[model samples]
Target: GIRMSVETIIERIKARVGAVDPNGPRKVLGVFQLNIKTASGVEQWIVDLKQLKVDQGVFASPDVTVTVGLEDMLAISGKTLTVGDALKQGKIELSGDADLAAKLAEVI
Candidate 1:
């Protein structure tokens, strides 16, 4: 099975998001699904991309949803480009409130 590290990917995303909003109330819900090429199944993770120190359940609903394959995620995370640029270029798929999405993009 492919040995992709979800923790590393999460750290990359955290860095991206933190760069934009060091202090913003824009709560985000990141439902990420990883499909390893050699793995027999998929893995899903729910990330709360927000600055506030709230409970996980607080971000039950996401202002925007980003869906991308594992390889694509790894590629983007490996790059030095901003998350906003990646999303605008269609490298990432975003759905839900556009305004909120934009705000969230600032951080991630």
Candidate 2:
């Protein structure tokens, strides 16, 4: 599938993450912050799986913070990039809930 762009990463994530199985028994109340570097500017996005919500801009206390380039994000979201490879090559940086960060492939 092709990747789509919205005004902000949060807005895009809101739509993508909406398909998650939030009510599943294996659900995790994960919260995440994404810091993306783009040619335009730096973008910050927050996702709260517990509430199935997403917001733009910095979060107060993010469970996990991910640092990546805009291209890398698009690649992941488009399924052209593997999370493991991206992590190994330093294309993606994650802090805190790294486990949930790995599972980000579900929607990325």
Candidate 3:
């Protein structure tokens, strides 16, 4: 079994999104720099969306920062819920620049 680490999941997402548009200027990185309550207290990871190969570069400072739990992230990655749909239903929370977040929503 593969470890469901943030790094691993980010890699998978990068591969998927990268395949979509390799030359898009609008780079949206999910900077997971917050401390999330976990069984082990808390965990954190700087999920560089662009570095994940989802975009060309860390071209942008993430259109939006989505704060979600490991389970929710896994669900999204596994195709259980579409990112857009999840956002609409409040399943995921977004912060930072709203305009940038909208652009990122298109890709993720």
Candidate with best lDDT: 2
lDDT of each: 0.51, 0.72, 0.56
Looking at candidate 3, what is the lDDT of residue 90? 79
- Using TM-score as the measure, the top candidate is 2
Question: Please, what is the TM-score per model?
Answer: 0.51, 0.77, 0.57
Q: Which digits, one per residue and each the tens of the lDDT, describe model 1 over residues 1-108?
A: 234465567566555545655455445444332222223444444444444222222234565555665666666667665576666676666566677666555544
Q: What order do candidates take by TM-score, descending? A: 2, 3, 1
Candidate 2 regions exceeding 4 Å error are 1-12, 103-108
Instruction: Evaluate model 2: give its TM-score.
Output: 0.77
Q: What are the runs in model 1 whose C-alpha is more than 4 Å off?
A: 1-3, 14-42, 51-60, 80-90
Model 2 lDDT on a 0 to 1 scale: 0.72
What are the RMSD figures for all models against the true structure? 5.5, 3.7, 5.3
Candidate scoring better on lDDT of 1 and 2: 2
Per-residue accuracy of model 2 over 1-108 as CA lDDT, tens digit each: 112343544456777668777666544568888788877777777777778887778888888888888888777767688887887888977788767765665445
Q: Which prediction has more favorable TM-score, 1 or 3?
A: 3
Q: Which stretch of 10 consecutive residues in model 1 shows the poorest summed lDDT?
A: 50-59
Which pairs of residues have clashing backbones in candidate 1?
17-107
